[PDB]
Design a protein around this ligand. Structure first.
Ligand SMILES: Nc1ncnc2c1ncn2[C@@H]1O[C@H](CSCC[C@H](N)C(=O)O)[C@@H](O)[C@H]1O
Ligand SMILES: Nc1ncnc2c1ncn2[C@@H]1O[C@H](CSCC[C@H](N)C(=O)O)[C@@H](O)[C@H]1O
Ligand SMILES: Nc1ncnc2c1ncn2[C@@H]1O[C@H](CSCC[C@H](N)C(=O)O)[C@@H](O)[C@H]1O
Ligand SMILES: Nc1ncnc2c1ncn2[C@@H]1O[C@H](CSCC[C@H](N)C(=O)O)[C@@H](O)[C@H]1O
Ligand SMILES: [Mg+2]
Ligand SMILES: [Mg+2]
Ligand SMILES: [Mg+2]
Ligand SMILES: [Mg+2]
Lengths: 393, 393, 394, 394
């Protein structure tokens, strides 16, 4: 539907001040921008709760133009555009194009009022039949409007709820990841993030997968989401979600896609869960995580299982994902090693500043690890330290 | 020192992703950007607490270039650059140019580590008299470094403390404004705001004034501050602060400066406090407040005083700043008036969505006031409403 | 079963440290506390989304005791305690009693893990019949568990969504209040608030009303909610929600109930919308709002309508709700009035520190208004002020 | 003067609603409560910036009683109570006793106005002598008042700044810990925390140490701070800070003090940095951390140094603090281990739900680790998992 470079540019300019919003609406056809925003809104809207179907008219204004979209809203159906004559219009919602840009893709504070105009029952002519129409549609029009307006803003969603909405197992039964994802990701939400997740989902099934990609799209209103899978997943692609076919164990492939699409604020490994793959992808992609970014590994349970290249004995971890996580502790501490002119700190040593481990999910913080080791003039035995620190007492 | 349009462009690009940061460093000379960032850092640093004077070397790296700045840090003096030989270097602080841009002017999450490199006592050769140097400088180097690093980030300051630091009476004695300012302004801090304050301070004194402008500059890390005063205040101008000479009671002048420098996220009237002036400035400048922005009026105490054009009787308020505020309540409510084809809502009616009043300070929220009045089918008397709302009971 | 004084005492102690949690479970029978917590959980749970009915076992543990509750979870039905044999148990959720107290009623940080134990398919025999059962109940058990767990915590809800859920017109069609309520109320959520709303809803209908009271109960996990209505609303009452029958225009009655149930952190007038009533209730109840609390008035539109005692001319506001709000501006500013020996500041003058007005909703901040007026040595005319502030410069 | 049990009880009640505040001021002598609050305020005040010495009168009112405290405020000196005649009174600050309790020790929202009354130059006679006094004391009174008022609230401090102020090496030169401490601790600030830090500071010096204990007291307005040191540190003790003399390597002693003073929301090891000691203290004290609490270890650098019982080879970590941290990863993952009837999960296994490692500082999250391992019906090899997850597609 929309060119990815264009969408990213729209998001980039929408994040600016008045001059950037004006630049955007000058650079691109306002009609096209309007269609882009409607596409985003349709994916952003929560599930409708109204049993009686209603229409919500969304009118987008720019200059002398008015782009009218009639949205059919009913429980157990996705919100979709229809013809004006295809139901009862419960509400007219009016946005200025630049205001809707700010609300969806802007860097903005929460605005409790004044972002739009609203005209209830906009075509209900005041005659004898009106009272009947009011009784039938009053509740449904309130519920339908609430759903559409929720899709016109950037309010922070509940990851646990999105997980269930999108049929991904991140929370609720096998796993309990989303509170950790929320804590680690929420501070990135006003940024134009590039997120790469390895493992789109659905494996060989021709129709399944994409639930977690949808989740990140919903969570990051200004984000671009990339999903990597060995199987074709092009049926998942939509506005702000691109899938790529390839093997996470192919370092040459990883180089090309990282240099094409990166650098990434967030990389998540939810792929094969083969231990060697986890290690290969980390080695290849950690360099392409932005400073201040995150590398996440999901499902370390496979570290203990030979069928995934793991080992039943937790101490025999040299080739496992948990062996990697343990080594990252030494990487963090590398500046504390006794000096050796024959030893140079490696890339990971120099570039990890935090490790967070929870049950079956770990977060690695990318950044410059150059705080300085304990200086040579601090004693390297306890008694000497006490003496040095006691001021002659 | 620096071209205002360049500074604004630097801040605009610094708020972007990797591509915008690369664009910035390609567009402008990295040496010039380095000097710009140092200028910002020097204004951002808190007062040093160290009694013993130390140097903190700040090295800014970009490609093969390394821009070194030696900052003299001592209690009761502003941090300033000096020659490398002008004291003991307690700390070397290393930043990549693009990382420092992000930390000062970026749209960024809080980064608790990994933004810089640090090398303590960087030139202290390990001979016999190092012990002496360590004892003299250990505490001062810690304190000096803490001060410099505070100036290298975008942590939210305390407005009440800035008010004392910059000698403005917003808090502590006559007035208690800063907690309200903090509550209303804090959500704007990751935006590239344009703030206009009427009333620079110092009146006719050739050297005084500018304290509140410095406060806003400190509070809004990506902001451009404008100060309007009838007296010349050009001595106040610095990076991100421009003063303008003119009369707040001159509507033509206000049009020109608003269209030249606006639209404004925030406008504050702290000027003459003449009631007619407050009302004139509001009428002229409210249209130039951005939707989602704020118009602030300070010092409404003058509403009661003839010498400022006010009235001792609080009921005789048709020409006072408090009369204005009272009328804003009706403006907010204007859609609830009974219909009249001879009456059109005015500009303020259509554009106010909130009013906040505290002792001697009021905040007006700019936005589209078009929610819809109570529909005609809601009864206009109590009994009729009760009967209509009771379902036949 | 649950005495109001007991519930409030449970909430009070639950907000404490380890010594208070131990005190609570020693003071009261753990079995009763367990039932009370389950009652709360049932009201907190979001609507279930699973088509296939499942059971979630909630086991509350204290000492050598284990209180087992089997909760039936299915879309379009309220979550209800059933017998162990009345369905497939998709999940066992285990909470220590003191931990569940902290999670529902405590003053606590967000805890992303470690508050409970979970055992999926807890009674599913590992045999040839398992695979079909897994296929049938996997998604339903996940969705069922999520709904229950959401009810076992204190996460802030979306007020706008609750408006549609509880059928109150605070947001979505006629009004757009909830974002303002959220901004003004969210900072109170870890306090044991007492909230009084005038106007329960439903008017004379024998079944309708209570939606906004439910909303405040959900928003304030440690709160006690009171609803006043001229009509009987006893069918609305549930844990942490009490309704009172009476007239908001009776000042002596208002003082009686305020003494009995106050002081209130929050009072909301969403009642008759008769202008005289709004003014009577405010004068009577503002003194019973806590310092740091809020008095809220909803639906000021009636200020312009003679059918509610209003006036079409906005300047004729001496008897309207908007006239009251305008007067609150002068009350805030009262210390700035010129000196007068026979004029003394009134109660409202001395006790208002903020006013917030939005379309059809206003928030009044109760607190000590005693900052001091501009001192007499600050000049009372512009030209003299310039001179006094210029340090001799001419 | 102030009994520790009494201080903790005051904080406990101050955190309640109106009924608890009334109970507090009925249970204890209001004059004593006012002295207690003044002692707290004095420790909370930031360094004064005014060159000219001023007095700020703090008047605490309860019932018909008025407790007057005259505070001397000048740069480079701690704020201290003096006689009324010992300087110029720049400002009178008035608090009701229950309001000051809420502001210092309450569970409260931020209140931007209405908490107090202020009367500038309260005893300055309006005559020909006033103008000179105003000129001398205007700026000093403003800055003086600002310092005192900052001490009368519960605003979050900057931990990095406090590190410089209290002379502790947590941030600025050798270490860069405070941003991590802020991130992990800030959500606890509303709670009546019990914090134990091993290592008070100063080692054998008779006067040095205590900086980090002061830091935690400042950061946690409702907290009780405990500091363990092998050396006597009784000179550090003040309101809400207790030092304990003893050896962190004595597990039986550690259990004794943990029973006496716990359970702890937060334990920090910043002690000897001997590897055996770090491991002993963790095993002994982790059971005494509350669910939802934190165990913090500082200065793991010593893991690499034989002079602290460490090893230069990072792989030789079986006895080091880093070996402990690595093992906690397996503890977190313990439910994923293949079945073994003779193997039983240990205490740490069952009670760790998170691990955070930064340069020279690590945070361990205490909680119930009982989420359940991957079920037996999820295939234990990649190829079988592909097949089971592909719905028949080949
Ligand atoms: N070597 C490899 N490289 C890339 N993807 C692989 C792979 N081996 C398996 N996969 C894919 O990894 C996916 C794991 S399932 C991913 C689930 C998804 N993240 C969610 O939460 O909804 C499967 O779709 C599988 O096809
Ligand atoms: N008609 C007019 N137009 C613009 N500025 C005016 C004016 N009359 C007075 N002023 C200026 O308004 C200022 C008021 S004092 C401003 C103080 C400043 N906002 C602070 O907080 O520090 C004086 O500097 C005075 O010169
Ligand atoms: N004099 C009076 N005193 C108290 N309540 C009154 C009253 N006159 C009318 N009411 C009640 O005020 C209510 C107004 S409707 C309240 C709606 C509710 N707050 C909600 O948001 O869902 C009606 O139930 C009506 O019975
Ligand atoms: N075995 C032991 N048990 C308890 N404390 C010990 C100990 N060995 C050394 N110590 C104490 O541990 C302290 C380490 S220095 C602590 C510094 C302090 N936390 C701060 O940040 O300012 C010294 O005071 C030393 O006396
Ligand atoms: Mg997964
Ligand atoms: Mg002013
Ligand atoms: Mg209402
Ligand atoms: Mg230490």
């Amino acid at each position: 539907e929309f060119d990815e470079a264009t969408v990213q540019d729209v998001v980039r300019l929408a994040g600016g001040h008045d001059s950037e919003l004006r630049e955007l609406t000058q650079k691109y056809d306002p009609a096209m921008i309007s269609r882009l925003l409607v596409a985003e809104i349709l994916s952003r809207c929560p599930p409708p709760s109204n049993d009686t179907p209603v229409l919500v008219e969304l009118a987008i204004v720019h200059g002398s133009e008015r782009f009218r979209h009639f949205l059919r809203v009913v429980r157990d159906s996705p919100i979709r555009p229809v013809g004006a004559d295809e139901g009862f219009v419960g509400m007219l919602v009016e946005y200025e194009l630049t205001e809707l840009l700010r609300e969806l893709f802007g860097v903005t504070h929460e605005r409790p009022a004044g972002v739009r105009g609203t005209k209830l029952f906009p075509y209900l002519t005041d005659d004898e039949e009106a009272v009947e129409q009011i009784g039938t549609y009053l509740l449904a029009a309130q519920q339908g409007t609430e759903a559409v307006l929720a899709g016109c803003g950037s309010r922070k969603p509940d990851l646990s709820e999105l997980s269930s909405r999108y049929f991904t197992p991140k929370f609720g039964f096998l796993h309990w990841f989303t509170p950790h994802y929320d804590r680690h990701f929420r501070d990135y939400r006003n940024q134009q993030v590039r997120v790469l997740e390895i493992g789109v989902g659905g494996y060989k099934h021709p129709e399944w997968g994409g639930g977690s990609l949808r989740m990140w799209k919903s969570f990051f209103p200004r984000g671009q989401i990339y999903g990597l899978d060995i199987m074709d997943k092009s049926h998942v692609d939509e506005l702000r979600i691109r899938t790529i076919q390839g093997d996470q164990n192919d370092a040459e492939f990883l180089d090309r896609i990282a240099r094409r699409y990166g650098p990434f604020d967030i990389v998540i490994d939810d792929g094969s869960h083969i231990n060697a793959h986890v290690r290969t992808s980390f080695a290849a992609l950690f360099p392409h995580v932005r400073p201040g970014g995150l590398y996440v590994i999901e499902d370390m349970w496979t570290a203990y299982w030979p069928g995934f290249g793991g080992q039943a004995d937790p101490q025999e971890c040299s080739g496992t994902s948990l062996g990697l996580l343990k080594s990252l502790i030494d990487a963090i501490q590398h500046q504390e090693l006794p000096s050796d002119p024959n030893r140079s700190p490696g890339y990971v040593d120099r570039n990890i500043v935090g490790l967070h481990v929870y049950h079956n999910v770990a977060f690695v913080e990318k950044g410059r690890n150059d705080e300085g080791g304990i200086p040579t003039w601090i004693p390297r035995d306890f008694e000497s330290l006490v003496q040095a620190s006691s001021g002659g007492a």
